[PDB]
Ligand binder design. Sequence first.
Ligand SMILES: [Zn+2]
Ligand SMILES: [Zn+2]
Ligand SMILES: [Zn+2]
Ligand SMILES: [Zn+2]
Lengths: 152, 86
Amino acid sequence: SENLKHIITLGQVIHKRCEEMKYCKKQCRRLGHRVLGLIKPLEMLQDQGKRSVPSEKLTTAMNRFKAALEEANGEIEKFSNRSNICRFLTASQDKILFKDVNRKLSDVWKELSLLLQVEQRMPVSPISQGASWAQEDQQDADEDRRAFQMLR
Amino acid sequence: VPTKLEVVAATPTSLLISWDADTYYIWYYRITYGETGGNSPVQEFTVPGSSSTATISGLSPGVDYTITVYAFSDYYSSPISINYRT
Ligand SMILES: [Zn+2]
Ligand SMILES: [Zn+2]
Ligand SMILES: [Zn+2]
Ligand SMILES: [Zn+2]
C-alpha cells in the first residue's frame, strides 16, 4: 500500500524533472515518458483499493524498479548541468545519456507486465511503438548531439 | 544497509558485481543468483564483510539473471537485488 504509492509518486517526480531539464531534452522527455508507461499499471492497481496485495515476487520486481528510478533520479540532477553533459558527450561514443538506465527499465517492465497480468489479473497495455528502445535512444542522442553543439 | 548494486565487469559466462556499504560494521554477505522467474533454482555463496565486490561464474550466455545481496552485521539488513543479462 504505502510502497505502491511511493513508487508511483517517485515515478511522477521523475517525469516532472525531465520536463524541466534544458539540455538534451529529447532524451530526457523520452525517459520521463517511459517511466510514466511503467507506473500506469501500478496506478491502475492502486485504483482497485485495499483488496489487491502484491506478493513477494511482485514486490521484488517493484523494488528493482524503485532502485532504477532512484538511479535515474541521480542521473537527472547530474545531467542538469551543462558541463556534466559536455563531459559525457565529449567522452562517450554513442552519446546516449541514460542507456544504462533505459536497459534496466526495459528488463523490469517485462517482469512487471508478467506479474501484473498473471498474479493481480490486471490488464496492461504496451509502453510505446514506432521503433525499439535501442533505435529510439540513438535517434534522440543524435538529435540532442546536434542541438547541444549549437549552444553558444 | 547495502546500496548501489551494479555489474561493473561482465563476460558471457561470468560477472563482477559491486555495491556500496559501510563495510566496517558488516560481518559477511550472502550472494544469491539464479534465472529470473518460473521458480528457477538459485545458488548461494558467502563473501566476507570487508570487501564490496563478488565474482559469479558458470553462467549461461544470454540469460536474464537475478542477483541478490544479503548483508549481515554482528556489531549492530534488507537485501538489494538487480537484473542482468549475460
Ligand atoms: Zn511529459
Ligand atoms: Zn562544454
Ligand atoms: Zn530480468
Ligand atoms: Zn545500475
